[PDB]
Ligand binder design. Structure first.
Ligand SMILES: *[C@@H]1O[C@H](CO)[C@@H](O[C@@H]2O[C@H](CO)[C@@H](O)[C@H](O)[C@H]2NC(C)=O)[C@H](O)[C@H]1NC(C)=O
Ligand SMILES: *[C@@H]1O[C@H](CO)[C@@H](O)[C@H](O)[C@H]1NC(C)=O
Ligand SMILES: *[C@@H]1O[C@H](CO)[C@@H](O)[C@H](O)[C@H]1NC(C)=O
Lengths: 1090, 339
């Protein structure tokens, strides 16, 4: 009664999980805990050398701005969740009987819905009725599971009579359903109709993430909804993913906290030594308090506040604005824009953007991500001929031309039976459209490719009748009438299918297609006549990643089909095991075939996929394929997308219950004990795992043992993997031997695999859409990961590296004068600058130069960064951003603060550095002198660390100097009169009226800029080894690995793949359909013609 | 929808990338050296142009001469005139029960210094930049407001209140102030000049707007305990100090940044100081032993930098040296590297 709604909220927070998840997301970084506690203990009286509310104020501004970026981010994903949630849905209403165009949100449990065809399904529905004979319907679960075939979803016989929209008012009762757990292939339930109990099963269990194909409509009683569904259950929270650059930021905050406690110990022990040694010479302080441990604690807190600004307060905010604004500028690129379905490459989490320069492993989906889910009839090895550049259609004009050579051509009955085999031996359904085109309803895209390819070559397939005729249409002829006698269903232990026919002259003939390892064991072909040329054309097909079948025939006499039809009739009516006895019959009939020829279809990859995978493997990235589809399909796709090259060994591992260590121990004993050069042995070796062979091999007795020596492969193609074990692979690789991972998928079989990654990319566009909305980056097409990753991650990591190291520099370049003055104040804790001017330093006047370093600069152009994918390996090793280089920047801030300090000591000696009538520059005139000098050394350094100068760098690098030189008389001339900074009375007249203030600002920064200007000259005129070295950069072990069990060479591959399941429908479908007779009065009603 | 093809949005902004050829960096270094050499010469010359005279008179009472004009030891005198000083500065210590160890200092100005002359007291090792020190003054109370008890600034804490009364100039700065009253005259001996000086226009112009005469009636307040010798009976309506007028209080309240500082007392900006022998009479009220360093008076005639400080003058020449030392390294290296 308290069931969920149908919203897929991929929001990072909803209403009440904002404040704990955002405050935990902010205080997981140490430079906000540190200012929470140096805000809290700054409230202790007579301790704060700055003010009570400085760190309160700027920490509050940091918290509000980070909550603003968090809020705009979560709104920009909230209207995308709402964009998926306002999708159409036809819902039966109790008031009036018509299905009305509601939204997905208004669907509840127990709600009869109607979905149309080739359009997605909103909820887990029991099929109660359909427009097809006996109420069946098809579905393509390429987002539930990953297989590209279609699935029979039969409705029950007692409920399929509710075809009419008007008559489902008396459909009353209940559904005692399953618990909402996430077993995809499993369902248990008992529907109660008006009188009877109905047993339920996963047969009538259309799930959420898949689309209804090749029907007209269904009627679906909604059971599970939203996150209650089987596919989106343990898969939608938008977790806090700590990027790998902010982790090493956190150990740099540990590093600066170490040098902090070194300075507070040096400083406060100096306060003990001077405060007890010269106590007779400090009598003008009245230090009558003899508690030296108490004043050690209080003064410890004074240096703990005064030194507290060495870690930058505007660190995580300015990194969130660089990451957010880079994520804006890469989600708005024409080179990453996919104009076919209008998707502008939106980046959602916006904080995992420098992860894109860190990626070492990519864990891709196959179906939809790598492929277009289309199968085109590419080629046909037909009587031993493909071609003699690549020409394929010229064979087809040589085929229509060679067929019309009927007086003098030996091949003409053979190619006639091959083209008959392409358009008769199948289970596709023809659909007469309204226009002048026919649409083939195919449960196999293999069979749809074969029938559409036979229709593009003469024989157009026209009408199926159930236990009756099966007519075609020739281009030369008019129409030929066949007669489908028997059908042999496809099976994975069978690897073939067959169909006994009756030609219109009365000749009963068999047609059969399948794998050569199964077909070729069962034929003669008159002493292997067409066999060997068929073999070498299978090797020509499998070398290009083409799905391949061996298409053969034989002949049957009248008495052989008489007695055999009898035996198959008593074989089909057995309820013990129909599949096994039909296999035993269906290979007692398939002796001594004649190999007519072979076919070749391609699974039609997404655009730019082999170029992308090739230029990512050049980037040092190891693409693994986590698919839910079959092994042979993914070997043909990895062969077609150039993962599997020529001469690659395919370490197959198809385990059993405890037969795991035989495969792993044999492959690793036979892999490690012999050692080649092992650089060109990486590139000829690949791993193929099952899903049952990986649920047994992802367990801690085999887990590190799998990765740390089976990462010696070039490609790991994990085949037929559930949505759970995909996430187990990603978590398993990011935990043991922690690299930086990327996940890309199209549908919600990958949503657990995308959220469990360091950065999870999703494919937006077509019917696979749920993975893109719950992603870190939604991308239109897989080829945009090449420019999104190599250009927009190498920029996003190097610019953020120089920005973070610069901000550490600038904060220890201002606030380290505070420590050099401890030596001169009395080891007392005297702040040099005014209180709010420091907050203005790390909030107003040095916060934009890191922003324009981190965005508007480039250190490599986008041309040479994608012409040389080798330059991506500069980021994977963490070369630009470490803790050693961090010590270079921090020590640079120490040297610059040291020479600003010592310089202004010697310049403003005695305070006697004014010409204005004998007056003296006080504490605070000197304070804004070292403040301003530190501003000019700091943005001068930001001028030295930008490579290119945009118009926004001229706003931030000199315009922050100009904005302080304009800001300071306004502030120090207005705000002292408002009792806010009363330390600034007369400081404008005694600084900007001073000759030696502007003289100090001229030269005293040019000392520090002499050091960094000459070093920045030297490291690009005589030390060029950042980019240019990278630009200027056997058979016995193979015989050993071929001897290992389950290792398959490339040269023996014949490329068989046939997407058809056992619950996909072969023998039931043909006996039901009519193409001639039209619809009924209610929907596209086809009667049960049986 | 489709993003715009603007140069901003598509990261095609008009960016200038400076190549660091030695046709650009090396004339920059020769130009920066060529422009910071003559200014740094002009800032050593204008810092060696001023003519000061510092006499450490801190050990005038314990060294006591008290009967004649005997010489000051060379540890204590520092003079930087244009001419050389023929007769060394003398010192004595008078005592006549009302002067209370005044230290007559008798120096010889050797040239008529025509720029405006300014008399400071230099105090070494007085940590006036201490954390407990640059606080400890009630800002509303130096404005003249009768700030009562429990409304006073708590930073004045040891020098905040007394025997059921409050201290009007509370805290550490407004206690503990330098009270060696310099005489308003450089008394010329042997009939040279009899040169006058003023304790007016000595502080900042904004201190004379903030430090105002108080609104107490001298029975609610009490003087701070260090200068209780000038007010032995306490505060009366007649002797109560005008903080707006005293103006040597508010040069002390303007706390300096360093332990070694000047503070202004006297000046004369309208006449030259001729080349006579001048007797400056300093009433020693402020002991050494309070702080831990030397008290000295400076007679200086500041310039564009404002004192004899060659630091920024030689500091244009360190930068102008490195822009010429590395402009020869990165040019002899630039020739000999493809040689
Ligand atoms: C000048 O200042 C000194 C110290 O700043 C004063 O000396 C103090 O006088 C009070 C009252 O006589 C004593 O209680 C202190 O112990 C003295 N401190 C010392 C000697 O270090 C001196 O009285 C002031 N002279 C004046 C105001 O004429
Ligand atoms: C000038 O000096 C003489 C000599 O001490 C003095 O009497 C006179 O008052 C001074 N004039 C002033 C201070 O205006
Ligand atoms: C400066 O000194 C001269 C004597 O050389 C004197 O006449 C004049 O009044 C003094 N000016 C001031 C402002 O004290």
């Amino acid at each position: 009664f308290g069931y969920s709604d149908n919203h897929i909220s991929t929001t990072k927070y909803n209403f009440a999980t904002f404040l704990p998840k955002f405050l935990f997301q902010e205080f997981s970084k140490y430079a906000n805990l540190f200012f929470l506690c140096t805000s809290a203990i700054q409230q202790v009286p007579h301790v704060s050398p700055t003010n009570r509310y400085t760190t309160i104020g700027t920490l509050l501004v940091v918290l509000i701005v980070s909550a603003m970026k968090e809020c705009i981010e979560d709104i920009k994903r909230a209207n995308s969740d709402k964009e998926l949630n306002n999708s159409t849905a036809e819902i039966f209403s109790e008031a009036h009987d018509d299905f009305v165009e509601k939204r997905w949100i208004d669907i509840r449990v127990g709600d009869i819905i109607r979905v149309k065809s080739e359009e997605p399904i909103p909820a887990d529905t029991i099929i109660l009725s359909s427009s097809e004979p006996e109420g069946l319907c098809y579905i393509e679960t390429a987002n539930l599971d990953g297989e590209t075939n279609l699935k029979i979803k039969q409705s029950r016989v007692e409920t399929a009579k509710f075809i009419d929209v008007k008559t489902l008012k008396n459909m009353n009762g209940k559904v005692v359903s399953e618990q909402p757990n996430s077993s995809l292939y499993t369902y248990e339930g008992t529907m109660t109709l008006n009188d009877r109990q109905i047993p339920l099963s996963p047969d009538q269990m259309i799930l959420r993430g898949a689309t209804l194909r090749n029907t007209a409509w269904i009627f679906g009683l909604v059971i599970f909804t939203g996150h209650e569904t089987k596919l989106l259950r343990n898969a939608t929270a938008t977790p806090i993913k700590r990027t790998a650059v902010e982790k090493i930021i956190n150990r740099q905050i540990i590093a600066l906290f170490t040098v902090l406690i070194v300075l507070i110990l040096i400083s406060s022990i100096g306060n003990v030594i001077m405060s007890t040694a010269d106590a007779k010479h400090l009598s003008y302080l009245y230090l009558e308090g003899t508690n030296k441990a108490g004043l050690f604690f209080k003064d410890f807190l004074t240096f703990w506040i005064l030194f507290s600004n060495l870690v930058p307060i505007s660190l995580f905010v300015t990194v969130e604005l660089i990451k957010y604004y880079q994520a804006f500028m890469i989600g708005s690129d024409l080179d990453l824009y996919y104009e076919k379905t209008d998707t502008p490459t939106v980046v959602r989490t916006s904080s995992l953007v420098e992860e894109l320069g860190q990626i070492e492993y990519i864990f891709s989906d196959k179906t939809g991500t790598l492929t277009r889910n289309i199968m085109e009839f590419k080629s046909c090895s037909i009587a031993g001929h493909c071609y003699d550049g690549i020409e394929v259609g010229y064979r087809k004009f040589d085929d229509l031309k060679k067929k019309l050579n009927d007086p003098s051509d030996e091949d003409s009955p053979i190619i006639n039976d091959f083209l008959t085999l392409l358009a008769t031996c199948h289970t596709v359904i023809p659909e007469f459209q309204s226009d002048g085109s026919i649409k083939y309803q195919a449960a196999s895209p293999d069979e749809g490719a074969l029938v559409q390819g036979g229709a593009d070559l003469g024989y157009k397939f026209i009408i199926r009748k159930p236990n009756s005729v099966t007519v075609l249409l020739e281009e030369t002829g008019e129409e030929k009438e066949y007669q489908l006698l028997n059908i042999c269903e496809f099976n994975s232990t069978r690897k073939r299918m067959s169909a006994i026919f009756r030609f219109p002259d009365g000749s009963i003939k068999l047609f059969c297609k399948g794998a050569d390892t199964v077909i070729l064991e069962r034929l003669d072909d008159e002493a292997n006549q067409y066999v060997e040329a068929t073999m070498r054309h299978l090797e020509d097909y499998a070398s290009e990643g083409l799905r391949t079948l061996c298409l053969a025939m034989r002949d049957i006499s009248e008495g052989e089909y008489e007695e055999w039809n009898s035996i198959y009739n008593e074989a089909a009516t057995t309820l013990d095991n129909r599949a096994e006895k039909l296999d035993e019959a269906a290979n007692l009939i398939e002796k001594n075939l004649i190999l007519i020829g072979a076919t070749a279809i391609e699974d039609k990859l997404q655009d730019g996929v082999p170029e992308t995978i090739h230029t990512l493997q050049e980037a040092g990235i190891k693409i693994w394929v986590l698919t839910g589809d079959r092994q042979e399909t993914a070997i043909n796709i990895g062969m077609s997308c150039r993962l599997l090259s020529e001469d690659m060994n395919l370490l197959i591992i198809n385990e059993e219950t405890r037969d795991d260590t035989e495969r792993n121990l044999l492959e690793k004993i036979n892999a490690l004990n012999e050692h080649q050069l092992s650089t060109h042995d990486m590139n000829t070796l690949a791993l193929v795992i099952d899903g049952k062979s990986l649920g047994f091999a992802l367990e801690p007795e085999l887990e590190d043992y799998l990765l740390t020596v089976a990462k010696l492969c070039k490609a790991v193609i994990c085949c037929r993997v559930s949505p759970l074990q995909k996430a187990l692979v990603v978590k398993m690789v990011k935990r043991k031997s922690s690299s930086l991972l990327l996940a890309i998928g199209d549908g919600a079989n990958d949503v657990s695999m995308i959220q469990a990654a360091h950065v999870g990319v999703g494919i937006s566009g077509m019917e696979g859409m749920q993975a893109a909305r719950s992603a870190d980056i939604a991308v239109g097409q897989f080829k945009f990961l090449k420019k999104l990753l190599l250009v927009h991650g190498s920029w996003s990591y190097q610019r953020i590296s120089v920005a973070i190291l610069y901000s550490f520099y600038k904060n220890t370049a201002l606030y380290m004068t505070q420590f050099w003055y401890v030596f001169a104040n009395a080891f007392s804790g005297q702040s040099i600058m005014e209180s709010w001017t420091m907050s203005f330093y790390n909030l107003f006047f040095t916060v934009w130069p890191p922003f324009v370093i981190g965005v508007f600069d480039q250190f490599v152009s986008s041309r040479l960064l994608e012409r040389y994918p080798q330059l991506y390996k500069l980021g994977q090793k963490g070369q630009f951003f470490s803790v050693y280089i961090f010590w270079g920047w921090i020590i640079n801030g120490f040297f610059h603060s040291a020479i600003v300090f010592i310089g202004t000591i010697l310049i403003y000696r005695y305070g006697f550095a004014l010409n204005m009538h004998g007056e003296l520059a006080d504490h605070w005139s000197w304070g804004v002198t070292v403040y301003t000098t530190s501003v000019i050394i700091v943005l001068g350094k930001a001028a030295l660390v930008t490579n290119q100068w945009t118009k926004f760098t001229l706003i931030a690098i000199p315009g922050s100097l100009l904005f302080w030189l304009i800001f300071f008389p306004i502030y120090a001339s207005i705000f002292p009169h408002a009792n806010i900074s009363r330390e600034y009375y007369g400081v404008v007249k005694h600084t900007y009226g001073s000759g030696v203030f502007w003289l100090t600002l001229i030269v005293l920064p040019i000392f520090a800029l002499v050091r960094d200007f000459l070093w920045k000259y030297y490291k690009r005129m005589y030390e060029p080894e950042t980019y240019h070295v990278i630009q200027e950069m056997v058979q016995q072990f193979q015989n050993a690995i071929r001897k290992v069990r389950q290792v398959q060479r490339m040269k023996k591959q014949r490329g068989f793949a046939f997407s058809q399941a056992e619950e996909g429908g072969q023998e039931k479908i043909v006996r039901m359909y009519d193409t001639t007779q039209k619809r009924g009065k209610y929907g596209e009603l086809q009667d049960a013609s049986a | 929808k489709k993003p715009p093809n603007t140069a901003f949005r598509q990261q095609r902004l008009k960016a200038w990338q400076p190549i660091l050829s030695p046709q650009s960096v090396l004339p920059l270094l020769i130009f920066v050296a060529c422009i910071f050499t003559p200014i740094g010469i002009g800032l050593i010359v204008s810092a060696t142009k001023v003519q000061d005279l510092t006499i450490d008179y801190s050990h005038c009472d314990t060294k006591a001469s008290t009967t004649a004009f005997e010489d000051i030891p060379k540890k204590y005198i520092k003079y930087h005139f244009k001419s050389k000083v023929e007769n060394k500065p003398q010192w004595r210590l008078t005592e006549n029960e009302n002067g209370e160890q005044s230290c007559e200092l008798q120096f010889e100005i050797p040239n008529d210094i025509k720029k405006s002359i300014f008399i400071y007291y230099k105090i070494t090792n007085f940590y006036q930049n201490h954390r407990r020190y640059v606080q400890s003054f009630d800002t509303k109370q130096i404005l003249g407001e009768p700030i009562k008890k429990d409304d006073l600034d708590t930073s004045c804490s040891p020098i905040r209140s007394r025997e059921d009364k409050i201290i009007y100039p509370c805290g550490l700065i407004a206690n503990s102030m330098f009270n060696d009253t310099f005489s308003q005259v450089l008394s010329g001996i042997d009939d040279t000049e009899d040169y006058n000086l003023t304790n007016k226009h000595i502080s900042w112009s904004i201190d004379r707007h903030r430090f105002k005469t108080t609104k107490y009636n001298a029975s609610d307040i009490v003087p701070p305990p260090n200068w209780m010798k000038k007010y032995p009976d306490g505060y009366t309506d007649e002797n109560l100090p005008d903080i707006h007028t005293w103006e040597e209080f508010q040069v002390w309240m303007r706390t300096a940044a360093f332990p070694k500082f000047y503070k202004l007392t006297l000046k004369n900006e309208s006449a030259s100081l001729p080349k006579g022998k001048y007797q400056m009479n300093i009433e020693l009220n402020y002991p050494i032993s309070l702080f831990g360093g030397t008290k000295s008076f400076v007679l200086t005639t500041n310039g564009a930098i404002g004192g004899r400080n060659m630091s920024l003058g030689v500091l244009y020449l360190i930068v102008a040296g490195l822009c010429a030392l590395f402009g020869i390294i990165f040019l002899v290296k630039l020739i000999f590297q493809p040689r």
